[PDB]
């Protein structure tokens, strides 16, 4: 803690973490919702599949 250099490092790190581009949660949300919707077709656990194409039934 009392190391001057670690406190500097810590601070430069927070600077790097502070000055990023953030998006509104609303858009970030929508983008996840979007992804989810655009890929729910391809998701065997989201739609129970026919046993035919399901390697774990027969």
């Amino acid at each position: 803690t009392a190391s001057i250099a670690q406190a500097r490092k810590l601070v430069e790190q927070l600077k790097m973490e502070a000055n990023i581009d953030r998006i509104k949660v609303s858009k970030a949300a929508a983008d996840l919702m979007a992804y989810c919707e655009a890929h729910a077709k391809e998701d065997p656990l989201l739609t129970p599949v026919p046993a035919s194409e399901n390697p774990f039934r027969e």
Binding site: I4, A7, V11, A18, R22, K27, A29, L32, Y35, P44
Partner: protein, 339 residues
Amino acid sequence: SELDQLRQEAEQLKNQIRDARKACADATLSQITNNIDPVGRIQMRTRRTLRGHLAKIYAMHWGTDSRLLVSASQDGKLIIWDSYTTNKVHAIPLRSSWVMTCAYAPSGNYVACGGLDNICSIYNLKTREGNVRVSRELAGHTGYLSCCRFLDDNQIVTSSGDTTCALWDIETGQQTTTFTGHTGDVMSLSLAPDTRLFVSGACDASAKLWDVREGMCRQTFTGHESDINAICFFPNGNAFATGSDDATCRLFDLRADQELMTYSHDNIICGITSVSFSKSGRLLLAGYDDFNCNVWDALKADRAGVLAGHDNRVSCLGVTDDGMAVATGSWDSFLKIWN
């Protein structure tokens, strides 16, 4: 004093980050997803049970072929299972009994594992000789190996109780990059699908986003009240989920730089060991120290399902690249495959 100033300045910058974040909290994910239909019945069933480990199971990883997987056990072995058949392709007697983690390489040519020996042992599967030998003993961590994931068949990332993570060159055995920032044992890592980033969860209750190729932490996510024991990327690579000893999972969004969603219920007191998304990320699966895996709705936060076929702790889990299936591994000595 310069130290005293740097302390204040870190403090301002913590606050500046907190306000920067609140400036994006225009809506919640919950709000945004109030429309979409629920997900309904997620009733999955044990297809295979994987019997062989003599003691607790600590971890597992699916091959990219969505068929094979390695699991690491207190019995001091790795078993690479063909999950279709339940046949042990390989059983690998480890040199240290204290294995905690293991990873299947993308190619499926190698696996890795390690634990209280503070070493990431790389096992090679196909020689021309047709043998399973220790090809590298990646040493440098000063604490247990907690997780490791191959980038390809020659770079691999590790995590460790020494609070650090690292990137290695297998061929040479060098620790080519070191990722520092965490203040407690690092417990889990997850690679982004592009693999130019990875996130790590730790006993400091924070998770961190790192650039593989640059060696630094870009973002630090907090909010958990206890150890982050597991972490997984959302499949598109702009969010991840964590599981913790505080009994919640959470979804953190990268570009918004913050928590969107806590997955929790007052009924659940036990901590989470492991998380993973379904292929579309819609489902967030978590292993718990109550013996169950809960299937959560990533978008709505409703609990949507329960895998309940283990007698001790669910210690690890995973979804196949192909989406088809879910392994759960457990302290009861078994892996069960589910869909």
